[PDB]
């Protein structure tokens, strides 16, 4: 499976399947990173520059920034969730044993939280150091690896959080709500669609709430839990959208959509005869998404091809 691009501090772009690819700025490749036949995620990457993947067969390897492994973490269980840091540079990721690990800097264990569900999303790191994780519903754990609350959204599966700048947190379910959450857990408010939802919320403008739907919709809600606005496309989106830094908002499905904030459409890009993943923007604003069949394609603002790239 193609994974996310994700753009380092410095310009370079990773993406890749079961290699991690390191790609410079102008298409160029700087190097090639292979763990085997296993998928990896896309990576998370540390203040001091150390990159971050998790592997299908159960490993987090930390990578120097020249391609060189610097440790594997083992656990032998299927892992799914991309990792994230936080809390002074420690590395947590979501397992199927239904654990989230913490994993300190050196490659040993500072703990492992248990759940009885499959952890297969992404955690988020509040401000304040709390971890969360969706699964078969909202878990924030401390950093000290105790439990802070759960949040039920009934039966359904919840997606990984977002949080926004005064502290509310928003997950989809997979029945098809978007819940606004308190820090303290309570539900504050939520939004039905009546279609599934696999698709994550992220939040930009003016702290507006984006998701796809099944029903082909990009869905942009407003902080109060009424609907901004919706954009019709002909397919289910199951990727999370992306807000770039003038506010427009992409999502990767059968091609590349770009909406403006005020839900009309932007551009499409299409990469040839393939689905693409979930974009990612540059602080210089080029975007970058990976086709099925493995090239990554960077994208000028305006959405005509900058470049691609295949091994």
Known sequence: IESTPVIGNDGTIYFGSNHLYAINPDGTEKWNFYAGYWTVTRPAISEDGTIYVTSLDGHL??????????????????????????????????????????????????????????????PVIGNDGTIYFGSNHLYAINPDGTEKWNFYAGYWTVTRPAISEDGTIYVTSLDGHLYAINPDGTEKWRFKTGKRIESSPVIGNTDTIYFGSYDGHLYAINPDGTEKWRFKTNKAIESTPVIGNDGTIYFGSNHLYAINPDGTEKWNFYAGYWTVTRPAISEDGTIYVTSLDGHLYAINPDGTEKWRFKT
């Open 61 to 122: 390897y930390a990578i120097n920034p020249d391609g060189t492994e610097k440790w594997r973490f083992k656990t032998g269980k299927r892992i799914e969730s991309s990792p994230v840091i936080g809390n002074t540079d420690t590395i947590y990721f979501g397992s199927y044993d239904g654990h989230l690990y913490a994993i300190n800097p050196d490659g040993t264990e500072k703990w492992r939280f248990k759940t009885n569900k499959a952890i297969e999303s992404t």
